[PDB]
Design a protein around this ligand. Sequence first.
Ligand SMILES: CCCCCCCCCCCCCCCC(=O)O
Ligand SMILES: CCCCCCCCCCCCCCCC(=O)O
Ligand SMILES: [Fe+2]
Ligand SMILES: [Fe+2]
Ligand SMILES: [Fe+2]
Ligand SMILES: [Fe+2]
Ligand SMILES: [Mn+2]
Ligand SMILES: [Mn+2]
Lengths: 286, 286
Amino acid sequence: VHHDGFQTVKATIDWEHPMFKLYEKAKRNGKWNPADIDFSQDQKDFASLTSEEKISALPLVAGFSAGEEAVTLDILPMAHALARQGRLEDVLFLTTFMHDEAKHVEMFSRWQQAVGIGQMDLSVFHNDHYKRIFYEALPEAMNRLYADDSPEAVIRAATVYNMIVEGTLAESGYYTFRQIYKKAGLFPGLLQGIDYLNMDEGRHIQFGIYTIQRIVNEDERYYELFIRYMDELWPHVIGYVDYLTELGKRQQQLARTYALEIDYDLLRHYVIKQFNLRKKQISRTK
Amino acid sequence: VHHDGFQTVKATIDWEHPMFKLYEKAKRNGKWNPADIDFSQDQKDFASLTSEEKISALPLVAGFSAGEEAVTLDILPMAHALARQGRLEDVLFLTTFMHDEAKHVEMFSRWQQAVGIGQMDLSVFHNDHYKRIFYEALPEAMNRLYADDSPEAVIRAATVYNMIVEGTLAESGYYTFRQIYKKAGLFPGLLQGIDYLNMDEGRHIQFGIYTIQRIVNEDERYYELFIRYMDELWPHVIGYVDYLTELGKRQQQLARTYALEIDYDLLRHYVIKQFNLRKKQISRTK
Ligand SMILES: CCCCCCCCCCCCCCCC(=O)O
Ligand SMILES: CCCCCCCCCCCCCCCC(=O)O
Ligand SMILES: [Fe+2]
Ligand SMILES: [Fe+2]
Ligand SMILES: [Fe+2]
Ligand SMILES: [Fe+2]
Ligand SMILES: [Mn+2]
Ligand SMILES: [Mn+2]
């Protein structure tokens, strides 16, 4: 359908819009390029691991590559919905969001190639709960926006994408990886990538908070919706966590070799903390 | 609809894909930030112009702000269509495309704000032909992709967007602006912006060429389609050119003051040359 007119012809960008400001910060702080990361030491590290230590790392990496690829593809309907509502500043920022995700996908894929597992099919580490979230719920919620951009639909999309996938699962995956491998002294290129990634993701979650809050500000009923959509996904969030946790207990060789007490009962609780923390960033009234 | 699996979990990015290579070049060469451009001299220049010299500049600027805003919004359906076909490398590159366009919109809008015409509604310089292209044909062709991603639909979208709007009209607008104001010594910030813009747009047109050619390579019948879609839009392309040309002849004050022989009959022919040149970049057989 036709453009009615154009905001930067009738007027200008809203320079004070929070999403314009977030866009400006993204440009400033979004310069990293995964093509510059030196993965040579990661190649050596991975090779020096035993076969059993080798796999220990793979489930988490499987979750991340899939996850970044899904969020790269699945933001597109949000950008469309907000474009069609005339939210130009949101769209500008979302170009940075989408390009960040592209770099995230690229980074993990480069790591896989470099350490020599690119030819391996890591889908084997996606259990039913992981699939429910990333192969199904996430694309369903986002694609819905093409035909239904109601407040309810937009809140649900931001909840699944920004608050659960990014704000709970991803945030926890950064923590877990850092905790295990930073302590080991392993995979410096990957950790550098994860650090840059974590910085970008700070902006993404702010967009999700802005989007959910601005809808909740129209009508408190929508607060209940937000809490409910969070709770509906929890079982799959924890059901994936348990499955990982449990894999990692069956191959604790990397833990004993590099002698780090991997407290799964501490990661499990970080995931719980993340989830509750995301709830608190939305208020019934603000 | 569900993700079947993920390319960077089953395998890796296709590092040799032409669009992956274009993506890598975009990251390297796409660092500029319109927020860094110094527009202070442009403010002085514009103020020092007479009222009649002032407007001389505005039609072209009106066409560009509208144009950048439209292409920012209207690439989204192409990214969707190619995502859904599993063309991950194209999608990665398209994140750079979309973010470039965001910077383009931002740049013109910053210039308008800086010289003090942000409050002016420049829609008055969009005639019927301009509207036919930018308010109508462009969004129609792109939005079609949501429900019809046939080769015919994808060729038509790339033709209107990449070959006509970018490759013919925009390319000619860069040339025209440089020709007039570079010679005058005016609007250095805007010209710097236009130079950065022109560099980005080199990549955009390569994507359009890749996309049209790869479809034409499946079936030569599609070459005829491409030439025909080009010709269908020409009347609106030249009909906008005439309207500009004609405005610029009625207010030739800026020409006489800054004493530059604005050869409209040379710009008109550049637009003709651009158009024919774009045709030549697609071969019936390649
Ligand atoms: C054993 C502790 C469990 C830790 C949880 C691990 C979660 C794996 C993370 C995969 C999600 C990646 C999604 C990307 C989101 C984004 O890029 O915006
Ligand atoms: C008098 C000579 C006529 C010159 C033609 C002027 C054309 C104005 C250009 C407006 C189009 C801008 C579209 C942006 C395309 C893109 O950013 O990829
Ligand atoms: Fe993200
Ligand atoms: Fe289960
Ligand atoms: Fe472009
Ligand atoms: Fe006409
Ligand atoms: Mn990410
Ligand atoms: Mn542009």
